[PDB]
Design a protein around this ligand. Structure first.
Ligand SMILES: *[C@@H]1O[C@H](CO)[C@@H](O[C@@H]2O[C@H](CO)[C@@H](O[C@@H]3O[C@H](CO)[C@@H](O)[C@H](O)[C@@H]3O)[C@H](O)[C@H]2NC(C)=O)[C@H](O)[C@H]1NC(C)=O
Ligand SMILES: *[C@@H]1O[C@H](CO)[C@@H](O[C@@H]2O[C@H](CO)[C@@H](O)[C@H](O)[C@H]2NC(C)=O)[C@H](O)[C@H]1NC(C)=O
Lengths: 417, 158, 79
């Protein structure tokens, strides 16, 4: 347009990281250039610019909470391995990876009540190693009362807290991992809340209310600060996901308007990743791909997380399917440290760049102190020892009710290692 | 009487006409009851607004405010029986340790209306003689005055 | 001629099949497989819960079909 090579603004150091989808995981500003790089545990499939990142570990699985079963599907092996059954009304799932450093992992799912029968939130041990019904699974109810419709759930691995939402209660209640102390951190100005995600690194929790006022909020993990990221053209924003690897960007799916979009952590840059997903109901992002469930046909669809490429059908589960969660170690980065210093008496919720003490609902801090509450200290509750038979071994309980393994000829050891 | 209902008319105001040519008072319309067998009264019914002493269930049904945590789940959706520990209670009711409300009259009456039986175990013996059962009844650990005939009678009522 | 009710309130059965002394039917509302004594004795017993998409239950066994029955056709007909 003009020979003004230096008209106030000229060709110079350009932060290409600002451009959307410049790099899958980590982009570094370079003078008139960029430096695309993966993260720990991720290796490059291709050249440095726009390098695809592959998880340096076991193949990722997709936990699929059907109405009566919670089966895990190994993406690479392209097969279904059954984990849970005989239950009913399972709505949302999430996992804490390895809480106790053992092979197994704890998975927190939700059960919605019908009629008089109240719902409940339950946890049990999912084995990270391949194992179907050979290992008996013992569901453990968190014994949370007054659970009406636990639509969504999320796990705070850093804070050891479980965040869940209830449509009927209209309260985003948080509690300890075993449910010792339960708090209503928002419990206000909510109309039909929905799937919730938590970001310990930013100390921010994100939820959606597909109710009359379609909104997506980004309140503090302790709930001190609350604000609405987006409130325009949201329809039914059921389903949410945080791309912790890439700028902690937020992605949501619009069931009513049949469109899947994304926003920044502050909700500034709003973009449409894909359109016409046939009413997506849940999302999850791993590496460079985003998966969603078209609840109508219970089908899984994948596409490039930056909106490139095309949607690809992968699986067709029963219509009952309600959520898709990508079960992998690197999905929930466990490197983030805990700022809590066992100062709070009962609960230590997280907040952006810090930690704040809280109290269980129905209790208050003792006068003059912000660390001790008035309620009693409930003893910790832990899960019973889980079946650990690794390679197809069948677990049997002894006279002491201790899980022992009928190890096969293929392997050996206490857990058929 | 029922022959000419097709020809029979209804009152212009305060009367609802059903598909069966049935005239019913306008108040009975949308009362949750099929005043006329054709259910025309309850065919299209937006839920009514609850009054001052009425709790609104998630089913958009109004129930008496005394029925919140009634310990009988009067509302179908069971939304009434929630947050009973954080609900305190009404001035004229006693709150069980479980958090539910019960009539203060039914306290220490020998009838464990509360599921946890706190309504009966929080009071001393019904007489200073040293027992809770006046009519030679059976007093379990929950201090419930199970009738002497009902003592060890089939199912464990206490 | 002899019409009898083997079971009642089967929760909207959609298909049947009989093997040995048991009859299996599908409650297509929630795709549950129910079994009961084929003569109407006993009680219905839930066995499986598959997707509501389930449309039939077929008992796959050798003795389910009497393959012994001889063929009366003597390759007389053209088609
Ligand atoms: C997922 O977890 C791994 C750790 O298991 C994360 O590795 C982290 O990498 C970042 C840099 O991308 C580290 O920050 C800085 O690293 C430089 C050296 O490269 C150092 O000089 C700085 O002082 C700073 O530590 C970060 O510390 C490290 N994580 C740790 C040790 O907690 C990886 O980035 C994570 N991937 C994500 C969240 O995308
Ligand atoms: C999903 O299935 C694949 C293929 O069976 C598993 O990967 C293999 O694991 C065995 C045992 O460690 C190795 O000997 C193979 O070399 C692996 N090969 C491949 C292609 O991955 C994978 O671990 C499974 N998913 C899990 C367990 O997360």
């Amino acid at each position: 347009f003009e020979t003004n090579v230096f008209d106030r603004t000229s060709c110079l150091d350009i932060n290409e990281c600002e451009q959307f989808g410049t790099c899958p995981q980590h982009c570094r500003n370079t003078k008139g250039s960029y430096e695309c790089v993966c993260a720990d545990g991720f290796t490059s499939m291709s050249d440095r610019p726009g390098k695809r990142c592959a998880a340096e570990g076991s193949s990722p699985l997709l936990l699929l909470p059907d109405n009566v079963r919670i089966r895990k599907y190994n993406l690479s092996s392209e097969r279904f391995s059954e984990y849970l059954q005989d239950e009913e009304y399972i709505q949302a799932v999430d996992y804490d990876w390895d809480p106790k450093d053992i092979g197994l992992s704890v998975v927190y799912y939700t059960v919605r009540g019908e009629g008089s029968r109240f719902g409940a939130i339950k946890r049990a041990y999912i084995p990270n190693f391949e194992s179907g019904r050979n290992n008996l699974v013992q569901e453990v109810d968190l014994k949370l009362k007054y659970v009406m419709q636990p639509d969504g759930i999320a796990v705070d691995w850093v804070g050891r807290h479980i965040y869940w939402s209830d449509v009927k209660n209209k309260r985003i209640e948080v509690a300890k991992l075993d449910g010792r102390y339960r708090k209503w951190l928002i419990s206000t100005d909510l109309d039909q809340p929905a799937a919730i995600a938590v970001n310990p690194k930013l100390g921010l929790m994100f939820w959606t209310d597909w109710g009359k006022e379609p909104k997506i909020e980004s309140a503090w993990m302790n709930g001190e600060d609350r604000n609405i990221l987006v409130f325009e053209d949201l329809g039914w924003p059921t389903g949410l996901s945080i791309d912790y690897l890439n700028n902690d960007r937020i992605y949501w799916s619009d069931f009513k308007e049949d469109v899947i979009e994304t926003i920044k952590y502050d909700g500034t840059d709003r973009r449409v990743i894909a359109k016409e997903a046939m009413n997506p109901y849940s999302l999850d992002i791993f590496e460079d791909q985003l998966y969603w469930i078209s609840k109508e046909k219970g089908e899984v669809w994948k596409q490039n997380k930056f909106g490139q490429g095309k949607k690809e059908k992968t699986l067709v589960v029963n219509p009952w399917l309600t959520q898709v969660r990508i079960f992998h170690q690197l999905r929930y980065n466990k490197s983030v440290p805990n700022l809590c210093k066992q100062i709070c008496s009962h609960l230590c919720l997280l907040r952006p760049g810090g930690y704040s003490c809280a109290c269980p609902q129905g209790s208050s801090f003792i006068e003059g102190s912000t660390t001790e509450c008035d309620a009693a200290i409930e003893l910790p509750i832990n899960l019973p020892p889980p079946c650990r038979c690794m390679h197809g071994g069948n677990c049997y309980f002894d006279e002491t009710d201790l899980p022992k393994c009928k190890c096969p000829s293929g392997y050996t050891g206490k857990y058929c290692e | 009487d029922e022959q000419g209902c097709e020809e029979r008319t209804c009152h212009p105001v305060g009367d609802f006409r059903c598909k069966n040519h049935h005239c019913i008072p306008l108040r009975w319309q949308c009362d949750g009851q099929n005043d006329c067998g054709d259910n025309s009264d309850e065919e299209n019914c937006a839920p009514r607004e609850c009054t001052e002493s009425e709790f609104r269930c998630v089913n958009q049904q109004c129930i008496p405010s005394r029925w919140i945590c009634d310990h009988y789940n009067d509302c179908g959706d069971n939304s009434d029986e929630r947050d009973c520990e954080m609900r305190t209670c009404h001035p004229e009711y006693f709150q069980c340790t479980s958090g539910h409300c019960v009539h203060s009259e039914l306290k220490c009456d020998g009838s464990a209306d509360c599921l946890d039986a706190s309504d009966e175990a929080d009071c001393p013996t019904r007489f200073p003689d040293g027992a809770y059962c006046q009519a030679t009844m059976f007093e379990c650990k929950n201090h419930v005055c199970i009738p002497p005939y009902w003592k060890c009678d089939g199912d464990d009522d206490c």
